[PDB]
Design an enzyme around this catalytic site. Sequence first.
Site, PDB file in Angstrom:
ATOM      1  N   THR A  34      15.051 -33.632 -12.655  1.00 13.66           N
ATOM      2  CA  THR A  34      14.014 -34.590 -13.063  1.00 13.66           C
ATOM      3  C   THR A  34      14.577 -35.945 -13.468  1.00 13.66           C
ATOM      4  O   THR A  34      13.806 -36.854 -13.809  1.00 13.66           O
ATOM      5  CB  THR A  34      13.155 -34.062 -14.197  1.00 13.66           C
ATOM      6  OG1 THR A  34      13.950 -34.016 -15.384  1.00 13.66           O
ATOM      7  CG2 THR A  34      12.527 -32.718 -13.869  1.00 13.66           C
TER       8      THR A  34
ATOM      9  N   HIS B 269      13.340 -33.237 -23.390  1.00 15.31           N
ATOM     10  CA  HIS B 269      12.566 -34.424 -23.116  1.00 15.31           C
ATOM     11  C   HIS B 269      11.439 -34.452 -24.140  1.00 15.31           C
ATOM     12  O   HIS B 269      10.877 -33.401 -24.463  1.00 15.31           O
ATOM     13  CB  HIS B 269      11.975 -34.412 -21.689  1.00 15.31           C
ATOM     14  CG  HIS B 269      13.010 -34.192 -20.645  1.00 15.31           C
ATOM     15  ND1 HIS B 269      13.569 -35.213 -19.923  1.00 15.31           N
ATOM     16  CD2 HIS B 269      13.610 -33.056 -20.200  1.00 15.31           C
ATOM     17  CE1 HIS B 269      14.464 -34.722 -19.074  1.00 15.31           C
ATOM     18  NE2 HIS B 269      14.521 -33.414 -19.232  1.00 15.31           N
TER      19      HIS B 269
ATOM     20  N   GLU C 280       7.634 -32.712 -19.417  1.00 13.86           N
ATOM     21  CA  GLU C 280       7.752 -33.132 -18.019  1.00 13.86           C
ATOM     22  C   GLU C 280       6.774 -32.319 -17.161  1.00 13.86           C
ATOM     23  O   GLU C 280       5.854 -32.860 -16.539  1.00 13.86           O
ATOM     24  CB  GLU C 280       9.200 -32.965 -17.527  1.00 13.86           C
ATOM     25  CG  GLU C 280      10.113 -33.924 -18.268  1.00 13.86           C
ATOM     26  CD  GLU C 280      11.341 -34.274 -17.524  1.00 13.86           C
ATOM     27  OE1 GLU C 280      12.088 -33.348 -17.100  1.00 13.86           O
ATOM     28  OE2 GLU C 280      11.591 -35.512 -17.379  1.00 13.86           O
TER      29      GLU C 280
ATOM     30  N   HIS D  12      19.171 -29.504 -22.923  1.00 12.88           N
ATOM     31  CA  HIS D  12      18.709 -30.785 -23.428  1.00 12.88           C
ATOM     32  C   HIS D  12      17.205 -30.729 -23.514  1.00 12.88           C
ATOM     33  O   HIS D  12      16.590 -29.777 -23.048  1.00 12.88           O
ATOM     34  CB  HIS D  12      19.142 -31.962 -22.554  1.00 12.88           C
ATOM     35  CG  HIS D  12      18.585 -31.846 -21.173  1.00 12.88           C
ATOM     36  ND1 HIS D  12      19.190 -31.101 -20.198  1.00 12.88           N
ATOM     37  CD2 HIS D  12      17.410 -32.268 -20.644  1.00 12.88           C
ATOM     38  CE1 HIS D  12      18.405 -31.093 -19.123  1.00 12.88           C
ATOM     39  NE2 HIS D  12      17.309 -31.792 -19.384  1.00 12.88           N
TER      40      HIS D  12
ATOM     41  N   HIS E 156      15.154 -27.832 -21.517  1.00 11.08           N
ATOM     42  CA  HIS E 156      15.726 -27.435 -20.237  1.00 11.08           C
ATOM     43  C   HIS E 156      17.074 -26.807 -20.442  1.00 11.08           C
ATOM     44  O   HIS E 156      18.011 -27.455 -20.936  1.00 11.08           O
ATOM     45  CB  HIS E 156      15.855 -28.649 -19.339  1.00 11.08           C
ATOM     46  CG  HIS E 156      14.557 -29.158 -18.843  1.00 11.08           C
ATOM     47  ND1 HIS E 156      14.377 -30.426 -18.352  1.00 11.08           N
ATOM     48  CD2 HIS E 156      13.345 -28.547 -18.826  1.00 11.08           C
ATOM     49  CE1 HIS E 156      13.121 -30.575 -18.024  1.00 11.08           C
ATOM     50  NE2 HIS E 156      12.462 -29.459 -18.298  1.00 11.08           N
TER      51      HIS E 156
END
Length: 257
Positions: A195, A93, A103, A91, A116
Amino acid sequence: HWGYGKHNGPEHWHKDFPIAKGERQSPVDIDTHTAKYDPSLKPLSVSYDQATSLRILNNGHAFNVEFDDSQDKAVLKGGPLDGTYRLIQFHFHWGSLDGQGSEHTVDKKKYAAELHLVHWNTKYGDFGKAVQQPDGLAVLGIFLKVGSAKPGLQKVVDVLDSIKTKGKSADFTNFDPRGLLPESLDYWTYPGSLTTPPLLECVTWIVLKEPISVSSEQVLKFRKLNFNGEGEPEELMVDNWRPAQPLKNRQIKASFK
Ligand SMILES: [N]S(=O)(=O)[C][C][C][C]C123[B@]45[B@]67[B@@]89[C@@]1%10B81%11B698B746B814B562B%10%1143
Ligand SMILES: [Zn+2]
């Protein structure tokens, strides 16, 4: 429940998940001049030749590309790891603007996004058991900057229209995650956490130094996704990143000089 808004975002998570204020939380800022080169670190072994993707899911926080992890196929080993870790999903962010979205940060630099690739330690039998262990997961993190398109990302971008809203999934077979890797496998590594809630302290982080380049058009399509479900007021899925957390005297190690 939790999310990324003013009322339910990262600064609130500790009320339901007190480990948010723990001793090994992620992400962190990577201070490149304090990270020590560790000549004992091995090259990372990324063996994705037999990876079998199944599906893509909008879970209301991001989208996950899911893999069949029933056999020993797509595995991460070497590097700082003992044993073998099996790929379960990847996935991203990302930000509302190209200046934010990652992140992890590098000397306080924020990238436009972060990928990630999540792997679980096969010695614990399945993912649910692995996340209860301090060495249960290995997450390979890859920064995205905006520039040239990433041809290997386009199949992902193109399916996003079909999973706009929370709870939608779509078949997503035969996707090859090798097309998301940069040229170099030089990395930083440290012990950390998920996270997102439940924020479990079960992750060996492996963050690649070399970002991938994606086009502005590619990341714009990530930003058309929705956090909300179908038939609910539209809230764009942007800024789904947790900011850097205290390092608390952990050491970040570099695989490269
Ligand atoms: N952002 S990250 O790379 O630190 C991991 C993001 C989700 C973590 C999860 B762990 B396994 B799978 C997914 B479901 B289940 B448990 B549940 B928690 B969430
Ligand atoms: Zn993540």
